[PDB]
Structures are given as C-alpha cells and as structure tokens.
C-alpha cells in the first residue's frame, strides 16, 4: 500500500458504506420500463414521493427482480441506493490545463479520451 | 389561443378574420372537437355501414387518449327511445374527460325528438368560477 | 326423457345443474391514487355441477342402479358424461354424495361437480429451427471432407495428369486467397493469407496425400467462415459460390488417364457443395440479423414527452452495459439489404432451393450417397426456416387500399397501433412511406 | 393447396382435373375429413357391430389429435328422438376443434328425420372476414 492508494480503498469503504445504509425499494406494477425496455440495474431514477415528507431526488437502482406468481401478477421489486456508493475513488458526485482537459473528458464521456 | 373551428353548410373549418385566422381561448372549441371527431369502434360494436372499417385517428396511439366521440354510430337509425338513449351515452362518454379535470363542474345532457326527423340533443355544462367566457355562434348555411 | 349418464351408465336429472368459471384477476390499488383497476390473468376451469336422482319401483332394482352409480363415479379416468343441459363432455370427477332418508325406499340422491380433462403441459416445447441449420451443415462438411479423402487416389507419375492435378489445386487455391484479399480491406486477414500462401506453395507433396489435401482445403474453407461477421457472409459466400461454379461447368491428349478426370471432378464438386452449405448457414444468420433489427420494443400507447437525451433510439449518455439487455443478434454477431422485404426473401429462398437441389442431383454420381442424403436434410432445414421466420410470421394478412394512403393511417385501420409502422413499408418494399399503392395487396402484420 | 375429395355414389374419392388432380384450398375439404372418417371410440362406448374393434388411424398417436368424428356409432339405429341429439352432439364435438382455433367464429347444428329413413343435419360454421370463399359442390351419381 502507497499513500495514494491508501486514500482510494479508504473513501471505497465510505462509499461502500454509504450505499449500504441507505436504502429504497419499491414494487412498480410492470415489467417493463416506461419507454418499453425491461427493468435492469444500474440505472439513476428520480425519485418524488413527496407525499410521504422524503427529501430525496435521485437515486440508482441496484437490485432488479421480476416476479410472474399467481397471486402476484406481473410485478417487479426495484430496490433503490445513492449513487454516490458506487463510484470510483477518482470521480464525484454532482491544477492545470492537464487538470482542465481531464475535467472537460470526464463531464463528457462519450468522447474520445487523449489516452 | 388555437384555431376557431366555424360551421356552415353543416361542416365545420377554420376561418380569417382581417390579417390571419380568427383564434379562439375557450371550451367551445375543446367541445365541437370532442364531440364531432370519430373515435375507433370496439370490437364488438355493429357499425351502421355494411362495411368492417372503425373510424380513428393515427395519433391516437401517440395522444394518450382516444380523440372523439362514438356519435358516428348513429348515422342511420328510426325514431325509437333506444337510439335516444344510446346518443345521451354516447354524449356523456365524450364530454366525461373533461369532468374528469377540473374544467367543468357538472354536466346535463338530454335527448329529444323535435319536429320529424330532428335529433335534439340539449348539453349544459356548469364552467367554474375562473373559467374564462366561451365562443359565441350559430351554424349557418349559403347557397 | 332426462337420462343423463357418466359411463354408459344411466341416471335421471333433479334439483339443479350449475356451470361456474371466470377470469383471475389481480386488483391493481395505489397508495394516495383513485384510479385504480385490474389485470387480466388466463381464465379458470368450468366448474360444473349436477344434482341426480335413481329410483324404482322394485327396492332392489333402484339398489342395484345406485350401486352401479357409485361404482361408475369412483373409477380412474375421464368419462364421457351426457346432460341434457352440458351436452356430451370429458370430465374427471371431484366429489359425490348419496344421500336416502330411510323413509323413501327407492329413492337415492347423487349429486356430483365434476372438472374438465384438460391435460396440456406447461413448457410446451417446441423445435428451435435457427439453431438446426449450423449443426446440420457441421454434418454436411464433415461428410463431404471424408468422401473426398477416401474417394482421392494418388497419381505417382510426373506427366500431364500430375501438373494438370496440380493446376486444378492451384486454381482453387487462388479463388480462395482472392476472396480472403477482398474481405481483408477491412478485417485483418494476414495470418490466413500466410497460411494459404504457404499451403499453395507446398502442392506438390499435397496432392500425394489424401486425407491431408482434404483437410488443408476444409481448414482454409472454415478459416473463411469464421472471418466473416453477419454483414459481408452471405456476400463473400455468393461470390465464392459462382466462381466454384463456374468452374464445375469447365469440367462436369492431355492426360490420357482417368485418376486425374476423377480427381478433379470431385475437388470441383466438393468445393461448391462446401460454399453452397456455407452460404446457407450464412443466410440463416442473416434473416436473425434482419429480423432482430426489424424490431421495437414500443407497442404502447403513451404521450411523446421532451425527452432531450438520444433524440433518435440508441441509449442515453453514459449508460453502463448492465443497464441494457442484449438481443440474440447482438449476441451471436459477438443485415443484408435483401432479407428486408418479402418478395426478396421469397426469391431469395427459391434460389437457395434450386441452388442446393441442383448440386444434390449432381452429388447423386460422384460422392454417391451420404452426401446427398445429407444435402437433402439441410435443403429440408434451411428452406423450412426461412419460411417459418420470414413468411409465416404471426398473425400476418394480405388486405387491398380503396387509395394511396401514408403508411401510419394504413397500419392504424389495419391493427390499430400505429407505432410500428415502418415495418409495413420495409417488409411490404415501399420506398416513401407516404405513398403506399392501392391496388396493389398490402401484407399487414398484427 | 391439397387435393380436393369429391363425393360420388356415397365415397369420396380423389378426382382428376385435365393435367394434374383437382386442388383446393379451403374448408370444404377439412370439413369434409373431419366429419366422415372415423376416430378411435372410448372404453365405455358400445359399438353397432357385434365385434370389439374400435376404428381409428395408425398415425392419431402422432398428428397431437384425433383424425376425424364419431358418425360411425350411428350405423345401425332406428327412428327416434335420442338419435337426432346423439348425431347432434357428436357433430358439435368433431367440428369443435376449428372453433378453438382461429378458422371459424360460430358452429349451429340442429338435426332433424326428413322424408321416412333420412338423418339430416344442418351445420352452419360463421367463417371470419379474412377467411377465403370455400369451395360448394353436390355428391353426384352415376352408372
């Protein structure tokens, strides 16, 4: 262990620790998504339920299991966490010009990177 | 503020008036779309031609809901309180979408036989207390 | 006469007879929302029901009908129950009662509920035809590879009848090697193309050995195969195919010996029966590649919203892998601008047809029998697939236009969903979608 | 396109038309088979004969169905109400199969005693819009 990578396993672990307190899940009545594709992880939801006096906005799926019992129908049991439990050490939540490259390629990762 | 739609000689279209087409920001457009604009047949449902066509709209499947109203059905019927009753429901399943909202209060719709051959039918809403003042007209004919 | 039976045995109808049966239904009721509703799930089993009386005027005779009775109900199987209200039916038995009073000496009360004998498995197994056309074509080349060695003889002379074999060798060698060079502008191709290089420069000691002259060609055939993806395979075989025949019509003094004219015609042979099995299985792939493509997952009658990511399908910005769920296509690829419409699948498949029953007749005199009676099957395979994928989709009907209407309203007084309404146009060959023809039979999918 | 059955001194035989067979492609010829080839009877079943052989088809344990209808129980059997509905109901059972499937929306059969000695039935079958005109004839004598 080098100091640099002392720091990124110690803020892993806070992240790790972070997703795994919180926690949301819900059961939505259809498989499928509201465009028309199936229900898969790794995926950030905004979350409204204002009703029952929740401050949350967004979160990110990480638990997907679809269920056709009979005295269930078709349901699907989403289960919800911070997104901020699952990023790299590098990146984050929402000292040069190598410093300003970097960010421009990181807001934006569909381009192509300098490598 | 949306086109105007101006019946004469029993259709209805837009108009001008002075530089560009008149609008209009009220119900009466909302109503004469809703209720004189074929929606699709059921199934089930025997249609006055001998034909096997449903009436609709293409976007109906990209508006949320059907467009217009079952009226159509009707296009060929007798003088018997049957056909009465069926355009009173048919009225009221129309219009229902806007009870539905808050845009109107209540509605009272009745059918009648006039003088021969007329199919009266006498809808009243009740607009609440902000709704704006609706469009004033009568269907007229020329030539 | 009410004389109602369960198995030939007679009974006399009373009291009531009932039939119950409906739909499951899931109630769908939302915390803090008033709209609720159900879902519709299968539809249970008619539950029917009667009420049957016996009775004499012997004692014993009525004794003996209800005993029969009782017997006949409690009997393993399914019987053929009669009623004046039912009809004639199948059933299997739930339960019965028979119910006397001690003071009524003739008479004896039934009352039965029985099921129908519907007996249907739930997998309901079925034969998956996409995946019968690569393993009956690994069969066909593993045959036609064997009857080559076995049916190769070595010539030992110097003379015409060597270098002309070495020709024939050389020539198909050079037809392999051009068709890997034309594939190789955009796939790396070197390592093929040094094999087949020093396989062509080593013919001389090759043509003496049978069995490894056949699996030198059969391996650079299969190093061909596998360098294609689903794009450019069917294409690269097509061409592979018309230069191997029009050799084999070049063929079908010099020499002066019959081990060359065989052994050259059966080279000739078994190189176009190994392309045309190749562009088979290649066809195959590529009406899975069309038909995938050819498909979306909308089928939904929602409100467009102000969507701003992937304006045009794709997947939005930044989107992992696990979030989406790949395609059997996808998968496989690890289209052709002719598997798109109808009337070019039909050709399509009629030319493969002819193609492959041609070269089956030819088979039947040189690589006698299994390679024929294997060609046969794959034909068999091949042509059932496409057209139980292509053709005879689901719910498929041909309908007439009174006028020219835009492809959206012509899909909408057809089915109903108007979303879909490019594949009527691709499948049907329009090229404007706004003007589809008339007169002219319409295919409508459902 | 199979080839069309046509009924001549009370058996149908297949028939030829200038070159080839005669072909057809509709529901007179399913109908045609099964209504009058005979499936295997039930255990339970009595049989007009004095013997024990049950009819049927070699291949019914391979085509996931029984071949054709029951009509053969009726062999031998006198004038008498109890005929007319066991006809009745064995023609309902036999044709029941197309009305599971998609190929006809309604089946109606009554039976009636014609002229003495006749057993008629009438079996009216509602084909659906995209269904094809099927194929009408009469059984024909000669010699």
Redesign the interface.
């Given at each position: 262990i080098t100091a640099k990578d002392a720091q990124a396993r110690a803020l892993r672990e806070q992240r790790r620790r972070l997703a795994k307190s919180i926690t949301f899940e819900a059961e939505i009545?259809g498989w499928?998504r509201?465009?028309?594709?199936?229900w898969?992880?790794?995926?950030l939801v905004t979350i409204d339920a204002s009703?029952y006096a929740i401050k949350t906005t967004e979160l990110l799926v990480s638990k997907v299991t679809l269920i056709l019992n009979?005295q269930?129908?078709?349901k699907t049991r989403v289960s919800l966490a911070p997104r901020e439990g699952f990023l790299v050490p590098v990146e984050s939540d929402r000292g040069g010009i190598d410093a300003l490259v970097e960010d421009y390629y990181r807001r934006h990762?569909?381009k192509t990177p300098p490598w | 503020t949306d086109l105007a739609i101006i019946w004469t000689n029993g259709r209805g279209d837009i108009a001008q008036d002075g530089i560009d087409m008149l609008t209009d920001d009220s119900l009466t457009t909302d109503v004469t779309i809703s209720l004189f604009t074929d929606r699709?047949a059921l199934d089930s449902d025997t249609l006055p031609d001998g034909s096997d066509?449903?009436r609709?709209?293409?976007?109906?499947?990209?508006?949320?809901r059907p467009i217009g109203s079952r009226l159509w059905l009707l296009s060929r019927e007798k003088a018997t309180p049957d056909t009465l009753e069926r355009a009173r429901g048919y009225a009221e399943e129309a219009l229902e979408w806007l009870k539905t909202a808050g845009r109107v209060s209540a509605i009272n719709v009745r059918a009648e036989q006039l003088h021969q051959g007329w199919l009266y039918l006498y809808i009243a809403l009740t607009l609440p207390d902000g709704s704006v003042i609706p469009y004033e007209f009568k269907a007229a004919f020329n030539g | 006469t009410g004389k109602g039976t369960f198995?030939?045995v007679p009974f006399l109808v009373i009291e009531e007879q009932k039939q119950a049966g409906g739909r499951?239904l899931?109630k769908?009721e939302y915390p803090?929302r008033d709209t609720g509703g159900v879902?519709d799930?299968g539809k249970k089993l008619r539950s029917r029901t009667f009420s049957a009386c016996i009775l004499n005027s012997n004692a014993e005779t009525a004794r003996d009908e209800a005993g029969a009775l009782m017997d006949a109900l409690d009997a393993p199987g399914s019987?053929?129950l009669?009623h004046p209200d039912f009809?004639?039916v199948d059933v299997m038995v739930d339960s019965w009662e028979c119910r006397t009073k001690a003071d009524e000496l003739n008479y004896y009360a039934f009352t039965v509920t029985v099921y129908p004998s519907l007996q249907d498995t739930a997998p309901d197994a079925e034969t998956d035809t996409s995946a019968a056309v690569p393993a009956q074509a690994v069969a066909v080349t593993g045959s036609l590879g064997d009857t080559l060695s076995s049916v190769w003889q070595t010539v030992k002379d110097g003379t015409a009848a060597a270098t002309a074999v070495m020709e024939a060798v050389t020539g198909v060698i050079d037809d392999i090697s051009d068709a890997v060079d034309n594939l190789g502008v955009t796939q790396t191709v070197s390592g093929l193309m040094g094999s087949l290089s020093a396989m062509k420069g080593s013919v001389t000691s090759l043509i003496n050995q049978p069995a490894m002259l056949a699996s030198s060609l059969m391996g650079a055939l299969s190093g061909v195969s596998s360098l294609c993806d689903t794009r450019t395979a069917f294409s690269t075989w097509n061409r592979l195919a018309q230069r191997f025949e029009r050799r084999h019509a070049a063929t079908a003094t010099s020499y002066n010996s019959p081990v060359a004219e065989k052994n050259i015609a059966t080279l000739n042979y078994v190189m176009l029966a190994a392309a045309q099995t190749y562009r088979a299985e290649a066809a195959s792939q590529a009406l899975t590649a069309a038909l995938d493509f050819s498909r979306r997952?909308?089928?939904?009658?929602?409100?467009?919203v102000l969507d701003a990511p992937s304006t045009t399908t794709g997947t939005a910005?930044?989107?992992?892998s696990?979030?989406?769920?790949v395609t059997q296509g996808q998968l496989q690829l690890t289209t052709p601008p002719v598997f798109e419409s109808v009337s070019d699948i039909e050709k399509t498949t009629a030319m493969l047809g002819a193609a492959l029953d041609s070269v089956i007749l030819t088979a039947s005199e040189q690589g006698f029998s299994t390679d024929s009676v294997q060609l046969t099957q794959l034909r068999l395979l091949v042509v059932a697939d496409l057209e139980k994928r292509g053709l005879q989709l689901a719910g498929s009907?041909s309908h007439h236009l009174p006028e020219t209407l835009?492809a959206?309203?012509a899909?909408?007084?057809f089915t109903?969903?108007?979303?879909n309404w490019q594949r009527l146009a691709r499948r049907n060959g329009i090229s404007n979608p706004l003007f589809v023809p008339g007169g002219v039979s319409i295919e409508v999918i459902n």
């Open positions: 009545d499928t509201k465009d028309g594709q199936l898969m992880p790794n995926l009703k009979d269930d129908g078709l990762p569909e | 699709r066509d449903r609709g709209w293409w976007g109906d499947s990209y508006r949320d | 198995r030939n499951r899931v769908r803090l879902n799930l019987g053929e009669v009809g004639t997952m909308d089928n939904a009658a929602r409100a467009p910005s930044g989107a992992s696990t979030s989406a769920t009907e835009p959206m309203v899909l909408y007084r109903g969903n108007s979303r």
